[PDB]
Amino acid sequence: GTGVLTESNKKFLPFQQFGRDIADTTDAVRDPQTLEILDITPCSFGGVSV
C-alpha cells in the first residue's frame, strides 16, 4: 500500500506483529529487521474547490 511511516508510541507486545483499527486496516507494523513499531498513516489528501 501507500502511506507515511512515522515512529509511534504504541506499546506493542513481543508477540504482536501488526495492529488493526475499527475497519481492520493495518495502522501500525513491526519492521522484521529492526524491532521498531511504526505508524502507517495514509498519504496526504484533500478536496480541490475552484
Binding site: 500500500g1 501507500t2 502511506g3 483499527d21 475499527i22 475497519a23 481492520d24 486496516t25 498513516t41 495514509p42 498519504c43 489528501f45 484533500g46 478536496g47
Partner: protein, 425 residues
C-alpha cells in the same frame, strides 16, 4: 398504567364566572435544530484506498461518485442556507446602549458579556458547554467534515443584534426602521396586545420586573439541572456520529468475497480471477455509501423542516407579538428572546399567565330604563350585592357608566337580563 394527568371538575353555571386577580410572567424554553453536520466522502479512498488497480477498475461502475458528491454538496448548501434563513433575518446590526437601565428588567443573563473573549451570554455559555481520535480515523478513510459558513461568533452577533433591536425598538425593526421606544411602553403595548390594559403594567412595573428577573435567573439553573434538556440538539450529533461510524464499519465486511483488504487479494490472486472478488467489495461499499446518502437526504429534509419552523417562530415570536395559541409559549404570549446553540436555536418565551382566580356572578346585560346595556369592552361581574364592569383578564371593578356599555334594543329578548341602574356623568 400511565396516568393522563390530574383530574379537575370545573363548576359550570349559567351565572358564575371566574376572573383572575393576579398574574405571573413565565420564561419557557424551546430548543430547535437549525443546521446539521456537513459531511463529504471521498469515493475512491472510501471504496478502495491506496490501490492503483482498483482506481482503474472503479471507472467501469458508472458515475455514482458524481451523484453522491452532488447530493452531498446540495445538502451542504441547504444546511448553510438554513443558518441564514433563521438568524440572518435582519440587515442592520444593532448595538446595546451603554446605560443598561430598561425600566427595571435585567437582561444581563441574555446580553453578551464583553469580559469573556467569546461574545456570548451566560445562557449561551451553558448551551455551548452542554452539547458535545474518532474524528481522525474517519478522516483517513474519505469522510471529512466541512466547516459552516457563518461561524459561532457571527451567529452570536446576529442574536445580539436581534436582542438589541427587540429591546430598544420592539417590533418596528422587523417591519421597517428601528423606532426607539422606552421598554416600559413596549411592555404596555405587549399587554394591550393580549387584552390587558396599560394601567396594570404601569402600576405593577416593579413586581413585573422582579418576576421577570426571577424567571430569567431560574431558567439558567433549570437548563443546567436537567441533563437531557439539550437533547433535541445532541440527538442530531449522535445520529450523524453513528451514521459515520457504521459507514466506516461497513468496510469490515467481505460481501461474499474472500477478504476485506484489496492488497490481500491483488497480491495472492492474479488479475484474471481477482475481478470476481473485487467487484463484490466494490458493489457492497458503493451500496453502503448510497444508503448513507439516501438516509442523509431524509435527515437533511427533516432538519430543513425544523429550520423553517424555527425561522417562522423567529419572525413571529421575536420580530413581533404572535397571538397564535401555543406557538410562542404556553399561554398569553408577551415576547421572545433568541439564543444561539451548537447547531440550534433556543427561544426564551416570556408569557403572561393568569393566577389567583375568583368566582363572581355574571350577566349578559343590564336594564335601567327598559333598554338593554351590553358591555363595550369587558364583562359585567358582581360581588354579591353590587354590579361592576371589568376586563376579561384582570379583576378591575369599575362603576357601570354610559361609556363602558352601549344600548342595543329592549331588554326582553336577552335570556339572562338582570335589572340594574347605570351611571351617567
Amino acid at each position: 398504567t400511565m396516568s393522563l394527568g390530574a383530574e379537575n371538575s370545573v363548576a359550570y353555571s349559567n351565572n358564575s364566572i371566574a376572573i383572575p386577580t393576579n398574574f405571573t410572567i413565565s420564561v419557557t424554553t424551546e430548543i430547535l435544530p437549525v443546521s446539521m453536520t456537513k459531511t463529504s466522502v471521498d469515493c475512491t479512498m472510501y471504496i478502495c484506498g491506496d490501490s492503483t488497480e482498483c482506481s482503474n477498475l472503479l471507472l467501469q461502475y458508472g458515475s455514482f461518485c458524481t451523484q453522491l458528491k452532488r447530493a452531498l454538496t446540495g445538502i451542504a448548501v441547504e444546511q448553510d442556507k438554513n443558518t441564514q434563513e433563521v438568524f440572518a433575518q435582519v440587515k442592520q446590526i444593532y448595538k446595546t446602549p451603554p446605560i443598561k437601565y430598561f425600566g427595571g428588567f435585567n437582561f444581563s443573563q441574555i446580553l453578551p458579556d464583553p469580559s469573556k473573549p467569546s461574545k456570548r451570554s451566560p445562557i449561551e455559555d451553558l448551551l455551548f458547554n452542554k452539547v458535545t481520535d474518532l474524528i481522525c480515523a474517519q478522516k483517513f478513510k474519505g469522510l471529512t467534515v466541512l466547516p459552516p459558513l457563518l461561524t459561532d461568533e457571527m451567529i452570536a452577533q446576529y442574536t445580539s443584534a436581534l436582542l438589541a433591536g427587540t429591546i430598544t425598538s420592539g417590533w418596528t425593526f422587523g417591519a421597517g426602521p428601528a423606532l426607539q421606544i422606552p421598554f416600559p411602553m413596549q411592555m404596555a403595548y405587549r399587554f394591550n396586545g393580549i387584552g390587558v390594559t396599560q394601567n396594570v403594567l404601569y402600576e405593577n412595573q416593579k413586581l413585573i420586573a422582579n418576576q421577570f428577573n426571577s424567571a430569567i435567573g431560574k431558567i439558567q439553573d433549570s437548563l443546567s439541572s436537567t441533563p437531557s434538556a439539550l437533547g433535541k440538539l445532541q440527538d442530531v450529533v449522535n445520529h450523524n456520529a453513528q451514521a459515520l461510524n457504521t459507514l466506516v464499519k461497513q468496510l469490515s465486511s467481505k460481501f461474499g468475497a474472500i477478504s476485506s483488504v484489496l492488497n490481500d487479494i491483488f497480491s495472492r490472486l492474479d488479475p484474471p480471477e481477482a475481478e470476481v472478488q473485487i467487484d463484490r467489495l466494490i458493489t457492497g461499499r458503493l451500496q453502503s455509501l448510497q444508503t448513507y446518502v439516501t438516509q442523509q437526504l431524509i435527515r437533511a429534509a427533516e432538519i430543513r423542516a425544523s429550520a423553517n419552523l424555527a425561522a417562522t417562530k423567529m419572525s413571529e415570536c421575536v420580530l413581533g407579538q404572535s397571538k397564535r395559541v401555543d406557538f410562542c409559549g404556553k399561554g398569553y404570549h408577551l415576547m421572545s428572546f433568541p439564543q444561539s446553540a451548537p447547531h440550534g436555536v433556543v427561544f426564551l418565551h416570556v408569557t403572561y399567565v393568569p393566577a389567583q382566580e375568583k368566582n363572581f356572578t355574571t350577566a349578559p346585560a343590564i336594564c335601567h330604563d327598559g333598554k338593554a346595556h351590553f358591555p363595550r369592552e369587558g364583562v359585567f361581574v358582581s360581588n354579591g350585592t353590587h354590579w361592576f364592569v371589568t376586563q376579561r383578564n384582570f379583576y378591575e371593578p369599575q362603576i357601570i357608566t354610559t361609556d363602558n356599555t352601549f344600548v342595543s334594543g329592549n331588554c326582553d329578548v336577552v335570556i339572562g337580563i338582570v335589572n340594574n341602574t347605570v351611571y351617567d356623568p
